[PDB]
């Protein structure tokens with residue numbers, strides 16, 4: 052796994068090629084600019100970005116660039132590249148600030164996801180992240196001890212030395228969560244992370260159980276964990292989540308190993324749901340916060 056410098060390397064290679072050709076054109080004119088936008092738009096469609104979002108990006112770049120009469124002192128090939136960079140950041144950016152825990156407060160974070168989302172590993176990763184930043188953090192499994200994800204979260208918590216709460220008798224996941232959050236609030240924890248059952252294929256049953264547990268524990272933030280390998284079909288998925296909760300965040304997994312990561316990122320951003328982290332592998336530190344400007348910076352660098 053040495054081949055690429057960025058998860059969107061194939062998209063980035065096509066965009067930097069387009070931009071290099073424009074910066075090397077002997078004269079910069081509308082034909083040269085349009086040739087570049089064509090290559091950029093095509094690369095984004097080949098990354099499974101939705102046509103509507105690709106058409107809007109092109110509009111925006113053409114609206115930002117005024118070739119005919121232009122500012123004295125500007126390098127106009129550089130201005131065009133900055134216009135494209137800026138519009139690529141917008142394309143993966145929700146336009147909205149994500150919720151963050153407050154220091155000195157108790158913060159309850161509830162996870163939801165469909166089967167195959169990587170929800171449960173993502174829980175321990177978020178806990179490790181906050182534990183490493185000096186927060187007193189804990190995990191609750193609001194699920195039956197017979198579920199595979201119960202042992203999974205417990206063994207992950209043990210290795211990381213993160214306090215874990217599950218029940219070895221209680222059948223009702225709502226009661227489990229309530230009891231778990233009560234215990235950890237009483238023990239002065241700052242970050243309290245609640246994993247729910249991931250054994251849902253349909254949104255219907257997933258969002259049903261989601262509201263049951265939400266109402267019981269009053270979470271400060273709900274994180275939807277999504278498999279990004281479905282590309283732009285992430286939009287409908289993210290919209291339905293966002294319409295059902297007030298304080299909504301998304302963590303994307305499976306962003307690698309396929310060509311559709313740009314589509315997935317831009318679909319979620321199109322719903323104005325902020326992706327807060329990316330899960331990048333099997334290990335507990337395979338995890339990174341999602342910052343759009345540095346993300347696009349590293350891609351085109």
Ligand SMILES: [Mg+2]
Pocket residue numbers: 141142143144145146320321
């Ligand atoms: Mg945007």
